Amino acid sequence: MAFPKRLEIGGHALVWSGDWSAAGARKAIAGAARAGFDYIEIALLDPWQIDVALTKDLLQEYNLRAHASLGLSAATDVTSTDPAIVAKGDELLRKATDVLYALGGSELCGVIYCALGKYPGPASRENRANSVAAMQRLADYAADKGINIDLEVVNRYETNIMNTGLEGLAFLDEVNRPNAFLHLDTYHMNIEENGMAKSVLAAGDRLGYVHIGESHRGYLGTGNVDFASFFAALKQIDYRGPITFESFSSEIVDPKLSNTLCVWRNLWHDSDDLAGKALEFIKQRL
Amino acid sequence: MAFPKRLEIGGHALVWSGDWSAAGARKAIAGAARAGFDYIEIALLDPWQIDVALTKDLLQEYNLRAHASLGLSAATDVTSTDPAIVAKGDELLRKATDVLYALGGSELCGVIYCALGKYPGPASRENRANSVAAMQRLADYAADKGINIDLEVVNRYETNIMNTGLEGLAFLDEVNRPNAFLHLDTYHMNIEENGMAKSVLAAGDRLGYVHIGESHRGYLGTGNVDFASFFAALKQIDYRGPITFESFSSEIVDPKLSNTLCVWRNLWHDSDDLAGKALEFIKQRLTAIK
Ligand SMILES: O=C(CO)[C@@H](O)[C@H](O)[C@H](O)CO
Ligand SMILES: O=C(CO)[C@@H](O)[C@H](O)[C@H](O)CO
Ligand SMILES: [Mn+2]
Ligand SMILES: [Mn+2]
């Protein structure tokens, strides 16, 4: 079975903090709460680094919910033809699920099905088969802990496995798990999709998670994304799931994410101004 | 001085051919000619590969003009803190210029100012200064051969040096050469620009070259690019320069370029259909009285 989802608006941690130190965690949770988000999305690329007790304390202090996203790396790539590397991926994904479970969360999303970043060539049948089997194992592990997994479709420079919602849905057909969902991100859609509606309408109840990012990943409404068409499509399918505002500036750097995402430019410096305008922007389109 | 530019529409070689063998050169030049393009843009990532005499004969046979684009690689990266790698870059750029000159061409464009692809971190002041100095030396070499150079602004995953038109213009001011121009590409703009007009309007006469690519680099008008604003901008600055249709499908693969551009998807397989529809699309928006 799937676990409950609700329409709720979140902020990604990199809007506020490049780390999850006591100070970094507080800055991000306080920032999301101040802006009036329902949840913070924690970037769990190293799930062993996060102090669960400290994080639970901060979420209670600020009356805030948490979901988690991550990308794997070459060392943890579940697409790998090296079985030791796939096993390191399974291990990281189980640890991320355990952290989310300890925080009382219900959603593990993002690039959980491969290494986030540049592949040297196209995926083989083996790469894909390895990824599908890894997401079956992860879905089954998460199901015991009341957690849905949401497979984020990202652009060609960030994966060779799935670059469109339609490809994502075909992948999910092969996974065939009730608690495995599609995750769409307007920034990635802006590059790869034939308009901003087709993949949402095709996905229907299988769309489990949404990222809102401008074309340049900066202030919403200052770039090229057709948000009107995207939000109309969400209304058509009566979408009732997480919507995270996601934005990257050289102002706030995570050394293990920011260089992978090639965030060379400062698109903003005022985290509170950006987040506050992002939430208002999203609520207006709902 | 700058060298003459004209409003002309071209097709990128990779629409037809992944190499420049006799058969490959003919397929691309015949293809560009059959679609009704004014010129072919030859990908010179390895300028020592080109049979110049064969290519000159083909361009004459089909009454077609040629421009050239390229990207450097790690071994030829003019941003490098290794002077030996910068020297290899200078040498490749000179050879590309020599090929274009022999073919009677006037435009060397694309990612001529760094290695095309993913950088592991942001560019240092030294990376940028090395690139600027290299583009000055290239501009001066090209100027003796009647050639303009056009620095192609590309997205964050393909360079760390310049990702917007506005960044391109500041870099170009540091180069300070009259035959050096900004080169904008709607595919890259779709990621990095605040709308499709700002950089064009800011560039004015400094815009020397244009690439037309859909958001996904497939059929024009099947993606997300606001071409209406882009072409409105070109009209407002009375743009008079090359406009190349550029498209990448796994159907046609240059091993030197296709994997760097992460072309994982086949968005087309009929070169003539893609190129014919692209020319129609571009012509309509150039004459579009709006
Ligand atoms: O869109 C992206 C990456 O481009 C993020 O959503 C990614 O999944 C990362 O894991 C965030 O933590
Ligand atoms: O836009 C691009 C690369 O994404 C091409 O135009 C590139 O500059 C190269 O010069 C092609 O040969
Ligand atoms: Mn995202
Ligand atoms: Mn281009």
Task: Please supply descriptive tags for the structure shown above.
Xyl_isomerase-like_TIM-brl (chain B), 286 residues, manganese (chain B), alpha/beta, eight-stranded parallel beta barrel, homodimer, metal ion binding (chain B), L-ribulose 3-epimerase (chain B)
Topology (SSEs and partners):
The structure is a homodimer.
Chain A: E1 8-12, H1 22-35, E2 39-43, H2 52-61, E3 65-72, H3 83-102, E4 107-115, H4 125-143, E5 148-152, H5 165-175, E6 180-185, H6 186-192, H7 198-203, E7 207-212, H8 227-236, E8 242-245, H9 271-285
Parallel strand pairs in A: 1-2, 1-8, 2-3, 3-4, 4-5, 5-6, 6-7, 7-8
Bound molecules: D-fructose (2 copies) and manganese (II) ion (MN) (2 copies).
One D-fructose binds at residues 43, 69-71, 110-111, 152, 154, 158, 185, 211, 246, 261 of chain B.
Terminal-residue CA separation of chain A = 28 Å
Structural class of chain A: alpha/beta
Strand content of chain A: 15-25%
Radius of gyration of chain A: 17 Å
The major β-sheet of chain A equals: 8 strands, parallel, barrel
Order of helices and strands of chain A: EHEHEHEHEHEHHEHEH
PDB class: isomerase
Keywords: Epimerase, TIM barrel, isomerase
Assembly: dimeric
Entry title: Crystal structure of N-terminal His-tagged D-allulose 3-epimerase from Methylomonas sp. with additional C-terminal residues
